[PDB]
């Protein structure tokens, strides 16, 4: 092809088992380091010095409870580089200080960039429109808002999600108790996009499978399809009539249908991201002021919204002392909010 | 517990509230109540909605 | 005589979809604006 650049390009784009491309020089090492960082930490690394927690198989945790936990609040938003001023090239200390957290978060962030470049690069070579890459911006906006923006607005990385199954659950419950995140209309659009996406997935796959044409003799119908065949493998006409009579409306345009399948969950995840940007600043949708004024003045006024705030105040009081150890919270028994008996 | 828009709720706080714990799993149709007043107090609409909805 | 001009279109379905988006947004966000 000519010069070294073009020769390298040739090599990068070879049609092999795992495509590489230029995006691969970014993608592969960052994806591999993020993942091996996760497996290494969850397998061998403690969270004792950062959280007062065990978090590895080595310490006795199981798959649901291991994590690579965030650094201590005293670390602020430090990059926590191995060779930074905190660890000073000491690998053991680095592990003990939360270095694997930023390691996994930043490599994962560059890996995600790499994956989306890989989607643009492959689509360009195959000659397709890059809608898949565009759809992937939703996972990006979620990762960036939640793993980067959020803790950057807060006091330190300590308040980011820790990479673990149970750690993520804790993150959920913290958002309920502290931010009342379920009330937030950007989270609600997120839910609509995720549940609507899942509905669209189930309903489209089931509709195709139940308006298939008989193009074979087999009672198993999978073999009666040919990737290169000109014709639709199912009847849009029958599908349309079925939904029209069942539900009252139906798709008629297959291009619309598919575009809509891209649109709904992508838009959903984007909306949740915007709300999480809000929560980085404690800019919550926490309260309805008119309910508070009525409830303050009328002790017989009660709604599900008042009931859930009592739950939140329970969550804050009861989880904070162990969840935020650097605050040294001591809450004597008499101050803890509790209802009767419990 | 106030569920309805006219009794101080918005779309987000509003609800049709579950029937009374004093009822338990007892069947509480409108004719089991002394009055609609009582029926409403005890959350009769919830049972009516969810039973017709589930069958439907 | 600007040759770049072109008409906007909006089919019926798109009208309905747009009205649904708007109405539904209004319904979802109105509580937060009354506060």
């Amino acid at each position: 092809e000519r010069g070294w650049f073009d020769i390298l390009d040739d090599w990068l784009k070879r049609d092999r088992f795992v495509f590489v491309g230029w995006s691969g020089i970014l993608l592969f090492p960052c994806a591999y380091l993020a993942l091996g960082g996760w497996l290494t930490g969850t397998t061998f690394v403690t969270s004792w010095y950062t959280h007062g927690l065990a978090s590895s198989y080595l310490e006795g945790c199981n798959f649901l409870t291991v994590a690579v936990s965030t650094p201590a609040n005293s670390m602020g938003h430090s990059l926590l580089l191995l060779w930074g001023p905190e660890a000073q090239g000491d690998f053991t200390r680095w592990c003990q200080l939360g270095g694997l957290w930023t390691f996994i978060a930043l490599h994962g962030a560059f890996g995600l960039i790499g994956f989306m470049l890989r989607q643009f690069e492959i689509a360009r070579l195959v000659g397709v429109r890059p809608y898949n890459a565009i759809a992937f911006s939703a996972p990006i906006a979620v990762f960036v808002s939640v793993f980067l923006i959020y803790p950057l607005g807060q006091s330190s990385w300590f308040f980011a999600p820790s990479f673990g199954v149970a750690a993520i659950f804790r993150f959920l419950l913290f958002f309920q108790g502290f931010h009342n995140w379920t009330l937030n209309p950007f989270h609600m659009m997120g839910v609509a996009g995720v549940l609507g996406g899942a509905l669209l997935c189930a309903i489209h796959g089931a509709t195709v499978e139940n308006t298939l044409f008989q193009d074979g003799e087999g009672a198993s119908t999978f073999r009666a399809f040919n990737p290169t065949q000109a014709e639709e493998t199912y009847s849009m006409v029958t599908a349309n009539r079925f939904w029209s009579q069942i539900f009252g409306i139906a798709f008629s345009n297959k291009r619309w249908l598919h575009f809509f399948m891209l649109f709904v969950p992508v838009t959903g995840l984007w909306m949740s991201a915007i709300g999480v940007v809000g929560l980085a600043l404690n800019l919550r949708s926490y309260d309805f002021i008119s309910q508070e004024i009525r409830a303050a003045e009328d002790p017989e006024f009660e709604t599900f919204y008042t009931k859930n705030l009592l739950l939140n105040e329970g969550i804050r009081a009861w989880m904070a002392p162990q969840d935020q150890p650097h605050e040294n919270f001591v809450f004597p028994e008499e101050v803890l909010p509790r209802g009767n008996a419990l | 517990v106030s569920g309805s828009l006219l009794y101080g709720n918005n779309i987000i706080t509003g609800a049709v509230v579950p029937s009374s714990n004093a009822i338990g799993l007892h069947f509480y149709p409108i004719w089991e109540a002394a009055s609609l007043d009582e029926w409403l107090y005890n959350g009769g609409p919830y049972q009516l909605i969810i039973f017709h909805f589930l069958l439907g | 005589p600007n040759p770049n001009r072109q008409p906007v279109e909006l089919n019926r379905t798109s009208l309905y979809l747009g009205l649904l988006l708007i109405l539904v947004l209004a319904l979802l966000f109105s509580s937060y604006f009354f506060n």
């Binding site: 006409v237 409306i249 | - | 019926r12 649904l20 109405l23 109105s30 509580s31």
Partner: peptide
């Protein structure tokens, strides 16, 4: 005014449902 607004938006959606169904663009097999 607040209840009215909620019920009004809701009623507009229900009407929009009825037109979307019964006065849809008919699907044409051509």
């Amino acid at each position: 005014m607040e209840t009215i607004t909620y019920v009004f938006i809701f009623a507009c959606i229900i009407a929009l449902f009825f037109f979307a169904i019964f006065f849809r663009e008919p699907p044409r097999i051509t």
